[PDB]
Design a protein around this ligand. Structure first.
Ligand SMILES: O=P(O)(O)C(O)(Cc1cccc(-c2cccc(NS(=O)(=O)c3ccc4ccccc4c3)c2)c1)P(=O)(O)O
Ligand SMILES: [Mg+2]
Ligand SMILES: [Mg+2]
Ligand SMILES: [Mg+2]
Ligand SMILES: [Mg+2]
Lengths: 316, 311
């Protein structure tokens, strides 16, 4: 009876959750917050707003939603990629464990979703905001899924440049489009900037792939090699070697990716194969320059001051 | 120019996603489907619909949402618990790897979310459905987080029975309340939430209980290998602390921290629970009392075979 009295009180009430329970499970997340880059993601949202003109308090909420998705996605990504470092610091899952980091990151996806309701009281608009949120998160996971499948089951599938670009459109375009589409839907204020934001996302991803090797060849650890990632330079090298009949090189690239090695000489041998044998580094540098010129040479404002600053710091 | 033309076509279109890409990404999920249990899940939904009377088409989508949430949460739970088996088969992360399984599980969470939108087009009711989905997923994660925290930080915090029960209301109550609450809002007809919470508690304590009991009557008692603060373990820890039985308290802690697969050591912890603290009998009794709260509910305060095959 005292037992049943306690049970009856428990089941007729909401679940008890304290501020202390809250702090305990936020550990994986608080750790990644110490990392910088939040001012650059905020700087993009700000330039875009000069076109969208959302009031500042609404923009603030869009910002928070996007920071949560972004940080949660990096927590998961580092587990998925087995990364030891992120922004010069030890990775959350190595500190608090994969179990807590996975649960916390997923918890934060749902807190971000909860924030959408603070953007309007209008039921029609709300529905659209949630649909955008849902769609681009579906897109993000589809892209990530392919990137991870290709890498983990290599050489089952050797992606082409086309396939790589479609995966980026889902993966990276997912979060870029999500921010921009929420803003365009909230705008109280010409043509959509989705194509432009897609382009920015592609430049962002390929430049990330490139610098990861270029910083190490010349700063960084070419950690993408250790991870075995089918990066833009690797995709070009794998397809170049196949096409030119460089069987031994094609096979050595695969073998090195499959070692998941941290040996600096082995990583440097692969990067020099990309520099002199396949010319994938030059191919990638020029491909990046051509994408950037599609904008810098966009006089007819077909895609489009502060535009450029953003494109040269797109690394942060 | 040919490169520019192709980039322009790419950026002006929706992201390319094919049926084959969908298949690749679904593999870790199709794997756990080969797991029976959908019928007992479906039967609970069917039986409850006799109070709610949702039209079949709507009931089917609620059922699909439930199946996705439950399957995805077990794909992730097995990674979190380093479980090698689920319903006798090899867990997905051991076959497809942890990276792919986490991502697929998460992708299905959002697929489930999308289906919510097909429950109704009425704008107010849609906000309500989404809020129910959002609230119960937050609860599930909160409870899972606390359960993992206690396990991974042991011995920093040893929960009490009360704290254990609040963790369960969040963790196990979440998917139970989520289903019930969705159906109650879609009903074209008292709340059955208290009863579904009670069902959830019985379900989690019985899960914890059978994991040790099935092993002792022959079950691998994986909860011990996992080192989790299950209901009988919580009882045993507080019992020994309270009776000032220091060495038994520490012995229980030492075994859980071993994360051991050794049958003989697992048995040793079960015999501490049987002979020293009498925790297994305390749990059998606790479950029976919760079940009686239902069998002796004559005024129908909670109610408007499932309770016996709830495991
Ligand atoms: O907590 P654990 O790790 O001990 C474990 O229970 C796994 C687990 C982790 C997290 C949540 C859950 C869980 C919560 C809620 C429901 C369920 N499963 S369920 O699919 O049978 C289910 C619950 C409520 C339902 C309500 C109405 C219709 C169908 C329902 C189905 C599982 C289980 P286990 O299988 O690993 O022992
Ligand atoms: Mg990464
Ligand atoms: Mg990655
Ligand atoms: Mg489990
Ligand atoms: Mg678990």
């Amino acid at each position: 009876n005292k037992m049943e009295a306690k049970i009856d009180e428990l089941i007729n009430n909401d679940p008890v959750w304290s501020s202390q329970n809250e702090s305990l499970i936020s550990k994986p997340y608080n750790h990644i917050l110490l990392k910088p880059g939040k001012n650059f993601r905020l700087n993009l949202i700000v330039q875009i707003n000069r076109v969208m003109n959302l009031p500042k308090d609404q923009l603030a909420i869009v910002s928070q939603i996007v920071e949560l998705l972004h940080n949660s996605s990096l927590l998961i990504d580092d587990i998925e990629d087995n990364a030891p470092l992120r922004r010069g610091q030890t990775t959350s899952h190595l500190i608090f464990g994969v179990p807590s980091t996975i649960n916390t990151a997923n918890y934060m996806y749902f807190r971000a979703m909860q924030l959408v309701s603070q953007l309007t009281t209008k039921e029609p608009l709300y529905h659209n905001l949630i649909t955008i949120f849902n769609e681009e998160l579906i897109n993000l996971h589809r892209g990530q899924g392919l990137d991870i499948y290709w890498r983990d089951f290599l050489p089952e599938i050797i992606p082409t440049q086309e396939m790589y670009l479609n995966m980026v459109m889902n993966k990276t375009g997912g979060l870029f489009r999500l921010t921009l589409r929420l803003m365009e839907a909230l705008s109280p204020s010409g043509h959509s900037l989705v194509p432009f934001i897609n382009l920015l996302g592609i430049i962002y991803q390929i430049r990330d792939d490139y610098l990861n090797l270029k910083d190490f060849q010349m700063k960084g650890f070419a950690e993408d090699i250790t991870e075995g990632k089918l990066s833009f330079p690797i995709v070009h090298a794998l397809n170049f070697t196949k096409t030119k009949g460089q069987t031994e090189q094609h096979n050595e690239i695969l073998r090195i990716l499959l070692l998941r090695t941290s040996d600096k000489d082995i990583k440097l041998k692969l990067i020099q194969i990309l520099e002199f044998d396949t010319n994938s580094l030059a191919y990638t540098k020029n491909f990046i320059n051509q994408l950037v010129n599609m904008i810098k040479n966009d006089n007819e404002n077909k895609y489009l001051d502060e535009l450029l600053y953003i494109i040269d710091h797109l690394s942060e």
